[PDB]
Amino acid sequence: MIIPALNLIDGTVVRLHQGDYARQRDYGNDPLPRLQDYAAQGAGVLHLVDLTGAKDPAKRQIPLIKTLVAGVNVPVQVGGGVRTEEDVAALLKAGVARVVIASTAMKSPDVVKGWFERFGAQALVLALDVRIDEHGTKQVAVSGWQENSGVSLEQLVETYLPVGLKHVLCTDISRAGTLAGSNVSLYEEVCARYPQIAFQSSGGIGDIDDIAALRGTGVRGVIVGRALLEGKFTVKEAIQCWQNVK
């Protein structure tokens, strides 16, 4: 499924080049109508990142997120700055379908295993956003991608598989926000290694052909952010492409 994404800094829709907070482009302070148009084009799930919160969990945009989730009638997943079990509970209570977590899942595995026990694996998406080095190590980034964690994608997948891990969002950070194309080889590999996980591809989609290029990877979701903000194609066109390649 196509998963349109919005990223938010202090109420403003933005695109960050490779997630670099010093490299923003602005797309207005009206995310709700934007999402509603996505949903009207047929979007089945929507993705929101609270970039203000990912950088400083003290400054999460909790009121805005609540308004956006309540303002559409399709499932919304939300990430950025979640740190506690109470954070997760509050998002789910406000109608969020799935809570997307990266930092704390790397930093405090015993704690997050407890979250899996309380909320169930259907309610949690593990974000494993990676900088892939020259040797091929898929190093997971945390703290709004500002920190390189020293831990691989695969180590973290194996950490949570025994407590029922089912949803993983995997961004190739080098592609994020660049329109350069998504990392097809990355998803081919990880999807095959972990057929029991529903992977969401993320970062780099630049045109309809880039979506089509993912058809054989086995990913269950295709996140698209920048290309939709720039109008490279419509959500309806993206959905048509994915329906068809499947």
Ligand X SMILES: NC(=O)c1ncn([C@@H]2O[C@H](COP(=O)(O)O)[C@@H](O)[C@H]2O)c1/N=C/N[C@@H]1O[C@H](COP(=O)(O)O)[C@@H](O)[C@H]1O
Q: Which residues bind ligand X (CB under 6 A)?
A: 5, 7, 15-16, 19, 47, 49, 54, 79-82, 100-103, 127, 129, 142, 144-145, 169, 171, 176-177, 202-205, 223-227
* Count of CB atoms situated within 10 Å of the CB of 242: 19
**Closer residue to ligand X (CB): 123 or 135:** 123
**Closer residue to ligand X (CB): 135 or 180:** 180
**Closer residue to ligand X (CB): 154 or 207:** 207
Closest distance to ligand X from the beta carbon of 204 (Å): 5
Angle at CA of residue 220, ends 215 and 226, nearest 5° = 75
Beta strand pairing status for 130-132 and 138-142?
A: antiparallel
Closest distance to ligand X from the beta carbon of 156 (Å): 12
Closest distance to ligand X from the beta carbon of 193 (Å): 20
**Closer residue to ligand X (CB): 31 or 80:** 80
**Closer residue to ligand X (CB): 49 or 191:** 49
Name the closest residue to ligand X (Cβ).
225
Closest distance to ligand X from the beta carbon of 171 (Å): 5
Amino acid at 86: E
Breaks in the chain (C to N > 2.5 A) come right after: none
Which phi-psi region, left, alpha or beta, contains residue 225 (left: φ > 0; alpha: ψ -120 to 50)?
Answer: alpha
Closest distance to ligand X from the beta carbon of 176 (Å): 4
Residue 107 tokens read as: 């930093």
Dist CA 199 CA 17 (whole Å): 23
Q: Strand, helix or coil at 146?
A: coil
